[PDB]
């Protein structure tokens, strides 16, 4: 029920003091727990009596077995090394445009030298996630326009139809039941309208 | 060049899109009994210019204020295609244009 990051979405070297690098974010307990590939990789890279830092817990590798122990958000970032995931995947799919209608914007996200994200919901439950960055991605020149719509559709509480492109899948949000893609447009949708 | 001036209109539908490589945002204007008027703008060599973003922000401002609008539109020769909007005006707040 959680969108799990793949194996290639993992940092070659960990991060100190819990400060994950820009464009990267700390891996939660649940995402690592339900992914065998990530566990195998971390076993293959971890040696000795060492504990590493995750978003919501600790990773006890080496002679400990490689167990994942839950914690409090940000609680164990004091450790020397923190495991971080790059928050983008290059899926390789072409320039296709998908839509989800009647949704409303909630749960904004922001990072340093990374992308602004928002969760679009319908009937309360989350429908999709979407993002936009002025720095990296094919849709960087998209950001100076889209955000304005986003701000309005966030402050006025309007239901729109969201266009996403699946060329890039994002793992910014933690324990997301919802897939996150590159935002492409926002449409104030009259039921059964042409502009939708 | 057949262009239309539509006054005392308010916008209900506003859409941000991706037309090929370039951008387009289309708006719909509604009078009490008149026909709906759809129009939008595109980036034709305006990749480095800021006209598109300025006009998009102005359309946003007009939409949020729920004001009457005076929009000039150039219409496509082929029916079914929304026209291109050249000039936008916000009418006096809680008021009607002359």
């Amino acid at each position, epitope marked *: 029920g959680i969108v799990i990051p793949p194996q290639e979405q993992i940092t070659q070297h960990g991060s100190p003091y819990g400060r994950c690098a820009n464009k990267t974010r700390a891996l939660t307990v649940a995402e690592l727990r339900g992914s065998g590939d990530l566990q195998e990789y971390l076993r293959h890279v971890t040696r000795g009596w060492s504990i590493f830092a995750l978003y919501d817990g600790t990773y006890l590798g080496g002679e400990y077995g490689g167990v994942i122990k839950d914690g409090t958000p940000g609680g164990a970032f004091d450790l020397k090394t923190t495991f971080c995931i790059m928050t983008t995947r290059n899926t390789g799919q072409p*320039a*296709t*445009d*998908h*839509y989800y209608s*009647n949704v409303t914007a909630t749960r904004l996200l922001s990072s340093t030298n990374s992308r602004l994200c928002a969760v679009f919901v319908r009937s309360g439950q989350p*429908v999709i996630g979407a993002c936009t960055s002025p720095y990296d991605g094919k849709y960087w020149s998209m950001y100076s326009r889209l955000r304005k719509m986003l701000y309005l559709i966030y402050v006025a509480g309007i239901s729109v139809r969201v266009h996403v492109s699946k060329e890039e899948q994002y793992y910014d949000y933690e324990d997301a039941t919802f897939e996150t893609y590159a935002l492409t447009g926002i449409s104030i949708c009259n039921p059964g309208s042409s502009l939708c | 060049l057949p262009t239309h001036l539509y006054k005392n209109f308010t916008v209900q539908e506003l859409a941000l899109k991706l037309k090929g490589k370039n951008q387009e945002f289309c708006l719909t204007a509604f009078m009490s009994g008149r026909s709906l008027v759809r129009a939008c703008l595109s980036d034709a060599g305006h990749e480095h210019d800021t006209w598109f973003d300025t006009m998009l922000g102005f359309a946003i401002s007009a939409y949020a204020l729920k004001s009457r609008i005076a929009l000039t539109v150039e219409d496509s020769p082929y029916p079914g295609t929304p026209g291109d909007l050249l000039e936008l005006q916000i009418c006096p707040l809680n008021g009607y244009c002359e």
Partner: antibody
Amino acid sequence: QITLKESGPTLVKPTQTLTLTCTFSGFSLSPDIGGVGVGWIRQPPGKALEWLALIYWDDDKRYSPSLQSRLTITKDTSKNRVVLTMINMDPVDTATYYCAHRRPPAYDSSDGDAFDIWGQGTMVTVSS
Amino acid sequence: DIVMTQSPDSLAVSLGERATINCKSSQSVFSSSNKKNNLAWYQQKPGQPPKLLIYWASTRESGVPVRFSGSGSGTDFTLTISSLQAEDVTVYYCQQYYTTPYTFGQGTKLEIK
């Protein structure tokens, strides 16, 4: 006004191939426009309606489970035509073949709206 | 897959009392992301392609006479004209569009005694 006319050869000899093309009028199947899709549906002269294949805007091609082995649906967006070819042509055929327009779904694009606009149909005939 | 089991072989009606065409679907045509049932009702005028009437087990499409109206939920669906006109007597089909081995119905013709 959406329209799709099924152009192809009427007569077919057993163990041959039948190529049929839908030429649309009022929609594109480009990956820019979501929701759209064209299907192929045949009805024998006196029996129920049947479904053959579905081609989407993202070049996603679904087939009948019991005909996927002998079906190949393709789409020329540039030429605006959906082409279905069928090998090993048996007499159980000789149906009428209509294309259709799988309308964009109301909310999402991973859903399905019914085929609103159909084609008139075309007569195939398998005989020796 | 989803298999329709359209119940009456053919029901004989007069141009009085409105008709009743029943339809079934094997497991479920319900969606949970749209909260909409997935059924389409088709009017087969002989010699011309089938025509679409009802979405979502209720929604009459466009220009279709208000005579036709359908309703259903879960496993059983039904179409009902409001007053049988002349053109009404034709064949009628179901179509689930929830999965994509799209399966139509066996059809029911409408007679006049």
